[PDB]
Amino acid sequence: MSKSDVFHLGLTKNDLQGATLAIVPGDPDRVEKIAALMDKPVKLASHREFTTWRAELDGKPVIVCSTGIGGPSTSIAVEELAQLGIRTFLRIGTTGAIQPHINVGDVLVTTASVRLDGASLHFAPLEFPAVADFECTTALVEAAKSIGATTHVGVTASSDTFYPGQERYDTYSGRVVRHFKGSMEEWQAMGVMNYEMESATLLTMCASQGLRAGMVAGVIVNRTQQEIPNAETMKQTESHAVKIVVEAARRLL
Amino acid sequence: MSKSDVFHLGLTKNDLQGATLAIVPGDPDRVEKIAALMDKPVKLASHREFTTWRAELDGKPVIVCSTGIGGPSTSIAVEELAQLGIRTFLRIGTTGAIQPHINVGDVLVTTASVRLDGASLHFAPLEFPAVADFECTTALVEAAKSIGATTHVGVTASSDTFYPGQERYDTYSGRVVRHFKGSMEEWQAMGVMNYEMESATLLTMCASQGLRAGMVAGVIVNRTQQEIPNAETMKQTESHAVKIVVEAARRLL
Amino acid sequence: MSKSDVFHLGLTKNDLQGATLAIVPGDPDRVEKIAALMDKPVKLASHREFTTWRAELDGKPVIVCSTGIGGPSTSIAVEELAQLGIRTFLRIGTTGAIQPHINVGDVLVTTASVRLDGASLHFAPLEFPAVADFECTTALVEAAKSIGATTHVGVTASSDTFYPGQERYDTYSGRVVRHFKGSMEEWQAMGVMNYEMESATLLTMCASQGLRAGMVAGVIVNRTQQEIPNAETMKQTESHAVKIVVEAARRLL
Amino acid sequence: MSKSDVFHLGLTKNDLQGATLAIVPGDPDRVEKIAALMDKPVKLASHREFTTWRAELDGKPVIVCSTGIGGPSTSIAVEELAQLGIRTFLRIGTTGAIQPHINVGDVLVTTASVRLDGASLHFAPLEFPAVADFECTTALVEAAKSIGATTHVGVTASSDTFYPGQERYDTYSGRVVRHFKGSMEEWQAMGVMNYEMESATLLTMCASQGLRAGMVAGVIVNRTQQEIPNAETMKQTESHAVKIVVEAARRLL
Amino acid sequence: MSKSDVFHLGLTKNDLQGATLAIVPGDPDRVEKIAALMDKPVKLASHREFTTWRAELDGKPVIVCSTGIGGPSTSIAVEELAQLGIRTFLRIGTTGAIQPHINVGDVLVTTASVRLDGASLHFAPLEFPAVADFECTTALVEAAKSIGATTHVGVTASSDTFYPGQERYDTYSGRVVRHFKGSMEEWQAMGVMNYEMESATLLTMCASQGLRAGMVAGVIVNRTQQEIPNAETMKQTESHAVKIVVEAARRLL
Amino acid sequence: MSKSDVFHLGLTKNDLQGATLAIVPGDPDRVEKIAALMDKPVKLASHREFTTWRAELDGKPVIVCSTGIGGPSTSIAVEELAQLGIRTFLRIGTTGAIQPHINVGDVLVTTASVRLDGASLHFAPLEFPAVADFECTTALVEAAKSIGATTHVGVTASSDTFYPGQERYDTYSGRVVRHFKGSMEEWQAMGVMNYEMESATLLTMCASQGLRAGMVAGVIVNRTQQEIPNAETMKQTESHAVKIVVEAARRLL
């Protein structure tokens, strides 16, 4: 089993030009959406879950990509992006929250994540912290002040499966949960704001070399309040979190 | 209807018409190649990473869903099809072998996998075994012997990362994966036949009720005797497996 | 000096005479009853809890050598047999099923085991699966079916101690049952059929290569009732799993 | 469902006849050599690895039951005994020390044992000290002194199988372990005495309330020197340590 | 002083008056030197290891306290203080760099520590990140700006014992573990700047509703190169370091 | 203080005279106090709780030094002392018992410690027992029972926390406790008697090195039996545990 260099993504080094910055959301039907709030946004490729788009932001280029679900999908998009020339990864998602005071619509800026995945352990072992960059968390927290969004800074728990423990989640069971049942109220007490699944790998890769990674979200859901949130409200959440990371980036370029 | 909180697959119990058995491939591109050998192929409501089709096999609606990359997505889909009604699951994919007695074109059926990953642990302790099911496995060997293809029954090893370590495969050196500074010559000497990323996760999640999960793969590469992959081996090899999984699928109805 | 640093259990050289299979019950007082069922059954050697007899099937030699309790004895036995040349093993014992629908006078066939021993880890990491060989496992399924028996097949939990967890058993207490406290309800609900003590070792230390091992089992009791046991028919099930163990070897010769 | 699962091959309470101490050897033959030394020795029964004798000592009854191999069977012994009534257990066997200064025909006392087994984990966590009892030990040392043996009070390495060292001993290997080999000058640099198979387990099943478990071994070899054999010296070490144990035992009950 | 319920060497709820912010350095001398750059410096109680001074910054109650040595003392200092109402905790230290690009005089502010200590695990699972509060960390760097000192914000290693791995030290010949023995050269290739023994614990608590925490430490010596230091200057390293924490405390009352 | 080249908080052999023994309590106040019972007690030094008196007893200069809190301060004021030739240590302090049959004011003797701390692991792996040296340990009980002091010999849980497991221990709180939930009752049922912070690092360190380590202490609190204390205890137990340490080192010299 030999090979010849690589395969995946679609990028060529020369495409993205000399971008350096990368915004990596999860969902591919959201990459064009972010690239729109910018100038001269182009489609670069769409090689299965990994959807690239370029744009300029004040004369300076910025790459909006797509990662997929789970740490494994992410670690690929990132491994190849970092080699293409990228040294800054800004992520925007729309998570759900485990804290009662956190309302739907608010922003979440992840200083660091509780590692509950298995891909991150390939980069740096379960002792090294999954910590976000400082200029990256700064840009995003101050850029959210210049948008007027009740931002929440803190810890996010990124899992390898659709968020264990209690919670509620109409959890499909009968054979309950494994060594993860009472883990939900535990994190909840430890001031962990939200669950999610890709940062453990994003942050820990970056942290452990070059780096400058950061995560920004938007609570589209909270495991307690009913009707939360009405559809119109849900999507209105997805927008502000894009203005903030495109804006965060303008402050890093 | 569903909106926030869970949703995931564009699916409803109604849309399966019984099913109970679903063949789950890697890329969605492959699913339709499978859905060919069968009658009345209706493409079901796709989504990100997870496709879903339905078809006739001896007058029994059977279904074909893609699972995405690795275990996190693999688990999501399983977690979601099971609910709908699917009890039995068979996975097909083309991999490469590590034993120099398994030439490209040989059909590897898995009975048990080396749990070397993280999503499995959400479903069982490291200790429980991730084994195929007796009824399912049998059929795959029986089918395979009917088309006279070099079946090999054994163990597979599931990494939760893109075949890295030190058998020249992409992730990056320097740090490597700490507690496993030895692997290739140590999975070899144990009789592991090939390396992949969703196998463990699927077998472990199943031997819990859905206990009906087998796995067959097509050797498309092999490092130990690297040279033999001549012309488009990938053809016969990818097609042989698609005849076997549909044949096995019919024995289990 | 080595006064033959090995001077261990059993015969030496060609007393087997080409045999390559071996039914390894746990009791010595059963090595007689078994070989008696073959043709021309001669006694070969004897050591504590180690009795070997040579008998034959359809013109082939088949040895029947007992292994003793727990895994540290089992290890030795195996290491000796395969050294002398046996390549296939057939174990059969008697267990106490933990599932309700099982019931007495039923044969259980193990696809793989849930490793709660310690000796197996001297062979393989806790990731390597404790799995039964295919050919071997099938024969026991085709032997039982063709003898008039109710055969349940699946997973067994091999305990290094006379089963902890939290079931009916008495016990002196002290600290009571450590962090195995809820392991009963767990495995029970995860679909393990019963507990044994020598499976995880044998299975794991064969599944590598030169595996070829399987396990038969007569259900002498259930740990989920308030009705039986049968009384005189209990041993009567011994004489049931034995024709089956005898049948499987004739089929593997 | 009065499923008498009560006594996994053994005896009745009156059999014990008010016994409270019990010297637990390893094999049936060393039981009879031990109970030869006490008053009016009676064979109570013999079933599988377990041969129980009844003796007297200063008019006081002393159970002498054989453990078998490794910690698995031993745990059934101590647990069956205790159940019938023993509160204090003394272990005795022969051993080869790994410490250079530790000569042959040199008895060794074990204050604590290095885990490395697997059944103890069924009693107390790896964190918990598998420790000898205070009384049972001084009794042991107070005996070694009165017999004239160079006693080496200390710690012992107890792994229920092979001792991880690519040694001058004998290593049957095709494929072995995961992350081990630290049994060479490692456990020897930490000044450990011998290699057991039953101590870590005995000690931990006892130290966890209702202890009184001491162990003494007679050194028959020294892995770091070749000059040997010497006919009866091992039988004389067999004789050395057996007196130390019967004699120690008297001081206890 | 003991009393009813508790008296673990500290002071009263009143001596603090305002409480809220505390500056926590190691040695008790440093305390006297830190409060001196503030007015109304009152001494309170040097009750063993932890010496508490109270002063006032910009007109409000402020407190300096020594933590002790390592995570267990760091942990007793933070508990009794938090009980009295202290929310913010700043750490001023002097360190050694393992980065060849961080000469003396430099200032290192810490984002998150690698949890190679025993003290943190008492607070969160191993997966938890010991990261500093955004506020004190921004304040730190901004403070360290109004002085002009070259700062580096980053990942600090926190274990027990003085600088692990292999340094030009005196590894006393009485045990040291190989499972940590080689990683310093790993942590540098991981981009971690410096070592310490109190951070991992300080951070993992506080992060757990213990409210806020952040750390600043000047560079008095780099191992990577020899020519440094100018061992005259150093007085002023701690100087600016001591001025920086005051500035940062001011920005947080 | 310390020094540029390994030198650290202590002194020199040049003023140690006859090394070998050391009585290492907690406080810096205790040193002089225990020292005020020997012969020709002179003060020798004093740093962060590392006070040292080089007192005499029956002819031998029996140094009394201090460790401070936790394994890390200990390890230093232990390992550097060792380098001065103190190859035998006796630990004295105070402590809170957990068995309900232990009254405030009776010395406890630690045979070995449950390893709940992080420094120990640097001296030996978790499996190696934090075991106390039989010689030191024997003298200890000889002494207590000698003066009727109600000695208890047993295991001791050694936490790097402040005696975990919890109960109405009060504290800031919020998140109850980590996995030390009910950990205390699990230790009680498992017979452990008291909690402590540095017997772990000490017993372990000395146990795999030069050797010899002892550990006594007094009981001013029972974390169950509320009715503090036995008469008024506190200051009386200081005397009853300290006597034993001089009476007891006066057998090792």
Side-chain angles (χ1 to χ4, degrees), chain A residues 1-2 4-47 49-86 88-174 176-253, chain B residues 1-2 4-47 49-86 88-174 176-253, chain C residues 1-2 4-47 49-86 88-174 176-253, chain D residues 1-2 4-47 49-86 88-174 176-253, chain E residues 1-2 4-47 49-86 88-174 176-253, chain F residues 1-2 4-47 49-86 88-174 176-253:
Chain A
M1 173 291 291
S2 219
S4 203
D5 44 279
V6 263
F7 270 120
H8 285 119
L9 285 201
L11 292 296
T12 78
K13 206 301 293 293
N14 268 298
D15 299 353
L16 49 153
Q17 166 266 322
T20 293
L21 201 147
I23 293 165
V24 284
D27 190 29
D29 175 73
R30 189 215 267 279
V31 181
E32 80 261 84
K33 287 188 169 58
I34 298 173
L37 306 203
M38 304 208 191
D39 296 296
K40 325 179 211 183
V42 212
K43 159 113 288 311
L44 300 190
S46 305
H47 277 80
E49 50 188 302
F50 303 172
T51 303
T52 18
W53 264 79
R54 183 184 169 189
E56 172 208 89
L57 191 31
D58 294 343
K60 299 187 175 179
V62 289
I63 280 295
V64 201
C65 191
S66 192
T67 64
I69 285 198
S73 250
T74 298
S75 32
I76 309 180
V78 175
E79 59 175 318
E80 322 206 1
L81 241 50
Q83 325 287 285
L84 256 357
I86 312 313
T88 300
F89 298 97
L90 278 188
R91 194 171 115 117
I92 178 262
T94 37
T95 108
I98 57 185
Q99 302 279 10
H101 70 113
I102 301 176
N103 279 39
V104 165
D106 302 8
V107 188
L108 307 152
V109 202
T110 314
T111 36
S113 298
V114 186
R115 277 166 65 173
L116 288 201
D117 74 296
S120 49
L121 286 63
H122 285 77
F123 302 89
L126 210 83
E127 291 99 73
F128 180 105
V131 62
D133 180 85
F134 188 69
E135 291 184 70
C136 284
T137 302
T138 295
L140 291 152
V141 311
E142 65 179 20
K145 270 242 134 252
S146 59
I147 288 295
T150 314
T151 294
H152 290 114
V153 173
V155 170
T156 304
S158 93
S159 163
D160 246 13
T161 64
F162 225 31
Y163 342 135
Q166 213 138 318
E167 210 159 346
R168 184 179 44 88
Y169 225 7
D170 301 298
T171 51
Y172 185 40
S173 218
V176 303
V177 173
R178 249 307 301 175
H179 40 153
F180 288 147
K181 201 46 171 171
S183 77
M184 217 297 266
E185 305 277 297
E186 185 111 318
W187 297 140
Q188 191 193 67
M190 290 169 161
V192 174
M193 36 178 18
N194 68 323
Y195 270 107
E196 152 263 340
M197 310 161 45
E198 296 71 15
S199 58
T201 332
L202 170 75
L203 305 184
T204 324
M205 168 325 208
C206 300
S208 323
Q209 133 83 230
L211 169 69
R212 287 165 67 86
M215 225 192 108
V216 63
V219 190
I220 55 170
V221 203
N222 183 316
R223 291 59 239 250
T224 61
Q225 198 67 219
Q226 191 162 24
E227 294 179 321
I228 216 52
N230 74 66
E232 305 109 10
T233 311
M234 308 215 347
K235 291 307 291 62
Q236 268 190 267
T237 256
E238 329 234 347
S239 69
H240 304 232
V242 188
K243 306 207 299 304
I244 306 166
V245 63
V246 177
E247 164 75 74
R250 191 196 293 139
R251 292 184 197 202
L252 292 156
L253 273 171
Chain B
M1 79 299 242
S2 180
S4 44
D5 193 26
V6 173
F7 91 110
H8 257 288
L9 254 41
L11 245 314
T12 77
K13 173 154 296 190
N14 286 48
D15 291 31
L16 296 307
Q17 307 188 299
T20 80
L21 191 162
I23 323 173
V24 303
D27 204 34
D29 227 22
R30 156 176 292 109
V31 322
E32 75 177 21
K33 282 208 274 197
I34 292 173
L37 306 66
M38 263 156 279
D39 295 295
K40 307 193 56 69
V42 306
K43 178 210 46 49
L44 289 188
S46 160
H47 255 68
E49 286 170 318
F50 318 125
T51 47
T52 329
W53 286 53
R54 199 181 55 227
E56 310 298 300
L57 189 34
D58 283 2
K60 299 303 142 189
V62 46
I63 99 158
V64 182
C65 177
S66 57
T67 28
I69 298 195
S73 45
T74 274
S75 83
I76 301 185
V78 170
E79 167 186 315
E80 310 256 323
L81 280 174
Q83 309 200 33
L84 267 21
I86 296 87
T88 295
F89 292 97
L90 305 174
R91 186 179 164 72
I92 150 196
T94 44
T95 184
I98 75 162
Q99 297 294 335
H101 70 247
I102 296 166
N103 345 268
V104 183
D106 290 3
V107 176
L108 315 181
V109 18
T110 289
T111 43
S113 318
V114 178
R115 282 166 58 180
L116 282 160
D117 64 320
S120 7
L121 297 167
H122 160 229
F123 297 110
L126 217 214
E127 322 162 316
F128 185 89
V131 293
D133 173 287
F134 187 52
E135 218 137 315
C136 307
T137 320
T138 305
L140 293 161
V141 140
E142 302 284 84
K145 210 42 272 297
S146 294
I147 94 175
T150 328
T151 312
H152 288 276
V153 214
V155 178
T156 293
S158 277
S159 317
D160 204 328
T161 301
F162 208 77
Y163 326 124
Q166 220 55 56
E167 195 245 286
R168 214 251 60 208
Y169 245 77
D170 317 324
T171 280
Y172 243 136
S173 60
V176 187
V177 71
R178 183 71 102 247
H179 67 74
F180 286 144
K181 309 296 189 179
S183 57
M184 215 287 307
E185 302 249 329
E186 293 165 66
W187 290 116
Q188 272 187 317
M190 317 213 92
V192 184
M193 321 180 289
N194 69 125
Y195 247 112
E196 287 287 298
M197 310 153 43
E198 8 252 313
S199 347
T201 323
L202 165 85
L203 276 355
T204 306
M205 141 200 253
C206 263
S208 296
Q209 183 207 35
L211 167 72
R212 284 320 272 292
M215 201 200 122
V216 80
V219 174
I220 59 189
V221 91
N222 175 305
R223 29 287 196 201
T224 56
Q225 225 314 69
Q226 181 248 2
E227 60 102 27
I228 235 294
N230 287 32
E232 180 64 13
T233 309
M234 204 173 282
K235 61 200 179 299
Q236 102 163 251
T237 315
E238 183 180 37
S239 33
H240 287 11
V242 188
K243 188 46 189 157
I244 286 158
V245 99
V246 189
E247 270 321 311
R250 194 159 96 259
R251 298 177 199 269
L252 298 117
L253 288 179
Chain C
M1 164 240 57
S2 310
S4 82
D5 269 36
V6 58
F7 34 33
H8 233 184
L9 309 325
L11 54 144
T12 296
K13 200 85 196 68
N14 68 270
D15 307 20
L16 320 188
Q17 279 257 45
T20 45
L21 193 144
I23 287 78
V24 280
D27 220 338
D29 302 20
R30 220 216 293 272
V31 184
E32 159 78 292
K33 317 310 138 186
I34 291 182
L37 260 71
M38 269 115 269
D39 318 314
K40 343 170 157 188
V42 306
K43 201 172 161 166
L44 290 199
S46 312
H47 275 227
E49 323 300 333
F50 285 123
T51 314
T52 306
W53 278 70
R54 185 169 69 165
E56 74 169 32
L57 248 29
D58 312 350
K60 306 279 186 187
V62 186
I63 80 95
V64 31
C65 168
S66 43
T67 61
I69 297 168
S73 308
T74 312
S75 289
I76 305 160
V78 175
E79 292 215 32
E80 239 106 49
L81 298 184
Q83 239 175 110
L84 261 14
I86 279 85
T88 306
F89 296 70
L90 278 305
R91 181 164 191 109
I92 169 200
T94 8
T95 39
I98 53 181
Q99 306 287 315
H101 58 120
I102 306 280
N103 281 310
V104 209
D106 279 348
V107 183
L108 303 165
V109 187
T110 296
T111 42
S113 312
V114 185
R115 314 178 50 188
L116 317 196
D117 70 314
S120 54
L121 293 150
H122 285 260
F123 297 104
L126 188 60
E127 307 87 78
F128 199 80
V131 55
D133 183 270
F134 184 62
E135 296 183 89
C136 291
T137 291
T138 289
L140 294 36
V141 176
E142 278 171 3
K145 293 289 285 170
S146 105
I147 295 295
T150 304
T151 289
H152 297 75
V153 36
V155 186
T156 264
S158 319
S159 198
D160 231 27
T161 61
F162 205 49
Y163 336 125
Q166 244 16 79
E167 55 146 290
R168 223 184 195 154
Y169 247 4
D170 313 301
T171 279
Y172 170 80
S173 290
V176 205
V177 185
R178 204 13 193 215
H179 57 234
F180 274 84
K181 190 186 177 56
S183 60
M184 180 54 157
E185 35 276 277
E186 285 274 324
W187 314 119
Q188 181 156 257
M190 280 198 181
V192 158
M193 303 174 294
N194 59 311
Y195 279 112
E196 176 44 82
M197 292 191 43
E198 304 72 16
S199 14
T201 310
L202 164 60
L203 286 193
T204 294
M205 192 12 169
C206 267
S208 62
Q209 170 129 349
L211 26 170
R212 289 266 290 186
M215 185 171 98
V216 202
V219 175
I220 66 170
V221 274
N222 203 261
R223 293 179 207 155
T224 308
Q225 296 307 336
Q226 233 224 149
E227 199 43 73
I228 46 92
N230 200 317
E232 38 275 352
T233 307
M234 188 168 305
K235 58 269 284 198
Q236 184 186 329
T237 78
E238 161 173 328
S239 292
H240 203 159
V242 177
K243 296 178 212 83
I244 295 180
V245 60
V246 165
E247 258 254 68
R250 55 173 310 113
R251 308 182 184 253
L252 270 301
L253 239 29
Chain D
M1 190 174 194
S2 311
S4 284
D5 291 353
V6 291
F7 234 101
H8 185 279
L9 287 281
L11 5 63
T12 332
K13 305 172 55 41
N14 48 25
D15 268 69
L16 287 262
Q17 70 178 11
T20 48
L21 190 136
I23 297 95
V24 280
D27 58 329
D29 292 297
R30 224 190 297 259
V31 181
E32 72 160 64
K33 311 326 290 126
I34 275 175
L37 281 35
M38 306 172 218
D39 298 337
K40 22 178 281 294
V42 168
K43 178 185 176 163
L44 300 170
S46 183
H47 279 131
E49 274 120 330
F50 321 125
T51 296
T52 338
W53 282 51
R54 183 176 60 205
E56 194 173 286
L57 203 59
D58 313 285
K60 280 89 77 71
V62 284
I63 296 301
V64 197
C65 201
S66 50
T67 46
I69 297 303
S73 35
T74 309
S75 67
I76 299 162
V78 175
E79 176 56 36
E80 299 275 4
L81 278 51
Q83 219 152 253
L84 283 181
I86 303 307
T88 147
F89 311 85
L90 242 55
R91 173 109 225 283
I92 166 60
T94 31
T95 215
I98 346 163
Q99 287 306 321
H101 66 259
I102 289 189
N103 276 308
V104 162
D106 233 300
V107 67
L108 305 193
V109 178
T110 75
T111 20
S113 219
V114 163
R115 295 280 187 118
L116 310 183
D117 75 326
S120 47
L121 294 163
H122 291 218
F123 299 101
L126 187 81
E127 285 104 46
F128 195 102
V131 51
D133 190 279
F134 183 71
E135 279 162 292
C136 311
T137 304
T138 167
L140 298 201
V141 304
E142 280 190 336
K145 293 168 183 289
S146 186
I147 251 93
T150 303
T151 156
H152 280 99
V153 305
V155 178
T156 294
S158 176
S159 92
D160 62 13
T161 306
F162 183 98
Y163 320 122
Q166 217 287 173
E167 52 200 314
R168 312 283 332 297
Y169 226 33
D170 240 8
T171 307
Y172 198 33
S173 191
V176 59
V177 291
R178 191 355 261 159
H179 40 263
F180 226 134
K181 56 170 53 201
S183 312
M184 329 169 319
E185 54 115 347
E186 160 103 359
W187 286 121
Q188 194 191 308
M190 305 181 235
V192 171
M193 277 151 37
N194 54 114
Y195 264 112
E196 241 290 274
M197 202 171 286
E198 302 85 15
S199 47
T201 325
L202 145 89
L203 301 202
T204 316
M205 191 12 237
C206 291
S208 318
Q209 273 238 243
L211 176 47
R212 309 264 265 144
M215 204 209 153
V216 57
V219 169
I220 59 151
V221 230
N222 185 327
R223 319 261 276 296
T224 33
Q225 154 66 299
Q226 72 168 126
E227 301 306 307
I228 206 189
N230 214 86
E232 296 286 321
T233 63
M234 304 27 204
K235 193 292 305 180
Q236 228 56 81
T237 283
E238 175 185 333
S239 298
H240 245 149
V242 178
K243 217 243 283 186
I244 301 174
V245 200
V246 188
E247 262 45 69
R250 77 189 310 127
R251 295 173 205 217
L252 314 172
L253 43 51
Chain E
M1 285 175 136
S2 274
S4 309
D5 289 55
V6 90
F7 83 24
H8 201 306
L9 314 170
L11 49 155
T12 74
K13 202 87 178 58
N14 304 44
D15 310 332
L16 315 155
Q17 301 208 99
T20 289
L21 182 124
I23 310 173
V24 302
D27 41 302
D29 206 344
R30 214 160 296 230
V31 187
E32 178 180 29
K33 287 165 281 175
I34 285 153
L37 350 110
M38 286 184 273
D39 76 309
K40 303 184 174 164
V42 174
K43 201 306 208 76
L44 302 186
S46 193
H47 268 194
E49 228 146 312
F50 332 109
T51 287
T52 320
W53 265 57
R54 171 194 64 206
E56 321 242 282
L57 187 40
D58 290 24
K60 269 191 168 180
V62 123
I63 300 91
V64 192
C65 177
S66 58
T67 45
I69 330 284
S73 44
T74 288
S75 84
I76 295 294
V78 176
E79 199 55 29
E80 244 293 77
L81 275 184
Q83 292 185 54
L84 296 176
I86 295 206
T88 310
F89 283 86
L90 284 163
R91 156 133 296 239
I92 338 147
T94 33
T95 46
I98 52 177
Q99 266 358 285
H101 68 85
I102 292 170
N103 302 262
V104 291
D106 287 358
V107 193
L108 312 192
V109 182
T110 323
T111 54
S113 303
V114 313
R115 301 178 47 191
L116 303 186
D117 68 310
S120 34
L121 313 166
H122 290 57
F123 291 105
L126 169 63
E127 307 79 50
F128 201 83
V131 45
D133 185 271
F134 191 58
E135 290 221 46
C136 321
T137 329
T138 30
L140 262 231
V141 305
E142 266 306 274
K145 292 310 93 68
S146 280
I147 318 319
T150 319
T151 291
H152 298 118
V153 204
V155 260
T156 284
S158 166
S159 196
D160 293 71
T161 303
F162 287 75
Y163 310 30
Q166 290 197 312
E167 301 82 6
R168 318 177 84 244
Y169 294 4
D170 178 58
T171 303
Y172 166 57
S173 311
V176 174
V177 294
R178 98 303 320 155
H179 57 220
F180 272 24
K181 187 185 286 74
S183 283
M184 169 187 77
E185 313 92 68
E186 306 265 290
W187 292 140
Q188 297 160 270
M190 211 77 93
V192 169
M193 23 136 256
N194 94 267
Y195 276 94
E196 201 236 337
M197 303 171 297
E198 297 98 353
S199 55
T201 304
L202 198 219
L203 315 195
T204 299
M205 315 34 176
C206 287
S208 308
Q209 174 82 33
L211 246 153
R212 319 145 69 199
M215 177 171 118
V216 23
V219 185
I220 53 177
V221 70
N222 185 330
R223 205 276 284 178
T224 316
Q225 79 292 119
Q226 306 280 264
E227 58 180 336
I228 301 312
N230 304 34
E232 312 166 326
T233 39
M234 289 334 114
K235 144 84 286 290
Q236 271 300 318
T237 309
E238 173 206 17
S239 306
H240 312 122
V242 173
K243 259 138 34 180
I244 282 171
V245 80
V246 185
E247 279 314 309
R250 203 192 305 285
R251 251 309 185 263
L252 300 156
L253 282 154
Chain F
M1 65 76 123
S2 195
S4 40
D5 300 83
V6 161
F7 330 100
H8 182 69
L9 296 179
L11 36 65
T12 155
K13 84 166 184 60
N14 296 118
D15 54 284
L16 206 309
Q17 263 177 183
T20 301
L21 234 118
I23 296 68
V24 300
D27 274 311
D29 286 301
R30 281 198 285 223
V31 193
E32 59 168 337
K33 180 256 162 47
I34 303 169
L37 284 179
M38 251 123 241
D39 300 285
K40 224 187 79 178
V42 43
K43 186 198 177 185
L44 230 61
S46 199
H47 303 265
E49 313 322 276
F50 297 156
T51 290
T52 311
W53 288 67
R54 183 185 49 183
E56 221 158 69
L57 184 53
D58 298 46
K60 312 293 173 196
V62 211
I63 124 91
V64 193
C65 193
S66 286
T67 64
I69 299 198
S73 316
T74 305
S75 316
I76 321 176
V78 172
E79 181 147 283
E80 309 202 287
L81 271 191
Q83 300 177 139
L84 287 177
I86 288 69
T88 156
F89 293 82
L90 272 118
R91 216 278 159 150
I92 158 71
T94 45
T95 183
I98 62 181
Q99 285 304 332
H101 68 88
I102 298 211
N103 275 44
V104 162
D106 29 19
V107 357
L108 303 184
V109 185
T110 297
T111 310
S113 320
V114 178
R115 291 169 60 171
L116 303 171
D117 89 345
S120 46
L121 275 290
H122 297 250
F123 296 100
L126 189 57
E127 49 253 286
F128 175 88
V131 71
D133 188 270
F134 193 65
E135 265 174 296
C136 304
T137 326
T138 58
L140 320 192
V141 175
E142 283 193 77
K145 276 306 165 182
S146 165
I147 72 172
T150 307
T151 331
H152 287 119
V153 201
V155 295
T156 285
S158 200
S159 77
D160 244 340
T161 2
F162 179 52
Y163 311 3
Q166 98 140 121
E167 77 243 57
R168 180 260 212 246
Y169 211 9
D170 310 286
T171 91
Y172 185 53
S173 217
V176 279
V177 171
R178 253 296 321 299
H179 93 269
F180 293 76
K181 244 295 194 153
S183 72
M184 166 158 112
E185 76 175 335
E186 262 140 274
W187 288 154
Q188 292 193 139
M190 190 171 298
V192 179
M193 54 200 203
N194 78 354
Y195 263 124
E196 183 255 357
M197 293 167 71
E198 45 286 292
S199 57
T201 272
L202 180 63
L203 302 172
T204 305
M205 185 155 28
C206 300
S208 66
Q209 306 183 94
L211 260 153
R212 281 193 111 189
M215 169 69 211
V216 67
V219 184
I220 60 276
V221 230
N222 187 267
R223 264 168 57 195
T224 30
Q225 298 307 354
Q226 307 300 226
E227 177 69 271
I228 81 179
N230 205 59
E232 261 171 325
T233 326
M234 313 186 256
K235 39 281 154 88
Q236 295 165 137
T237 285
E238 175 160 299
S239 304
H240 283 223
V242 291
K243 285 194 61 184
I244 310 305
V245 72
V246 299
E247 320 277 15
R250 213 193 197 118
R251 294 168 173 282
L252 272 90
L253 324 169

